[PDB]
Point group: C2
Chain length 138, copies 2
């Protein structure tokens, strides 16, 4: 249903939740990727407050791009995504960090390096099909 | 125009040329990938006679997947692809190797590890839009 790369303007603060439903575009043997980037401007070259990159079946890396430069990457081996299955990815803004849940289970967190109020745009891209994208505020 | 991941059944021998026209789906700053895989069966989990993977603006890796296992990867830093531009990629089957041309210029080669006559399917995927795919025989 949704075009990939997927772009949507967005604002985030404490209590915001970004929810993504989709499925990998390839079998895990072929190592598809998923990337979710919280950008500071509508341009894709803009800074990235929160970068979330899944190499399905292998690892996750999280980072930020600040004044054009990648910072300290955080690596995680948690891999709750299942081969060939739909996933529901939810990214919640807490006061001190993002909490990333996959199919209802807390799987990753990432401390705010830039205030989330700096976010203007979310991009979801790489090797997924995308059926649902929502930003909600509570 | 063409769906990505793109799958097309194919046969290859000496004199075969696979021609791909497309453009990256992201700015090079965001490091999109391109992957071209020559498979031994119609299944995406099948062995890969020739694997060609571009990290736009960084490197290329080439390899083969034989009985399910990746082999010796070949790395190249040649990067003739231009940021934000259409490319024309042509992969020609010579008796002893594949020759990969990008916009008319020979840019990569890869010696046959498996006879090209074992190929049954070509997949073009990752972060590109695809406007043209052809297999031709001379």
């Amino acid at each position: 249903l949704l075009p990939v790369p997927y772009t949507e303007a967005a604002s985030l603060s404490t209590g915001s939740t970004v929810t993504i439903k989709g499925r990998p575009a390839a079998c895990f043997l072929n190592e598809p990727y998923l990337q979710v980037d919280f950008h500071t401007e509508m341009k894709e070259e803009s800074d990235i407050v929160f970068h979330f990159q899944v190499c399905f079946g292998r690892r996750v890396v999280m980072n930020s791009r600040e004044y054009g430069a990648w910072k300290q990457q955080v690596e995680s081996k948690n891999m709750p995504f299942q081969d060939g299955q739909e996933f529901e990815l939810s990214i919640s803004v807490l006061p001190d960090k993002y909490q990333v849940m996959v199919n209802g289970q807390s799987s990753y967190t990432f401390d705010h390096r830039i205030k989330p109020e700096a976010v203007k745009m979310v991009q979801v891209w790489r090797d997924i099909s995308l059926t649902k994208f929502n930003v909600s505020y509570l």
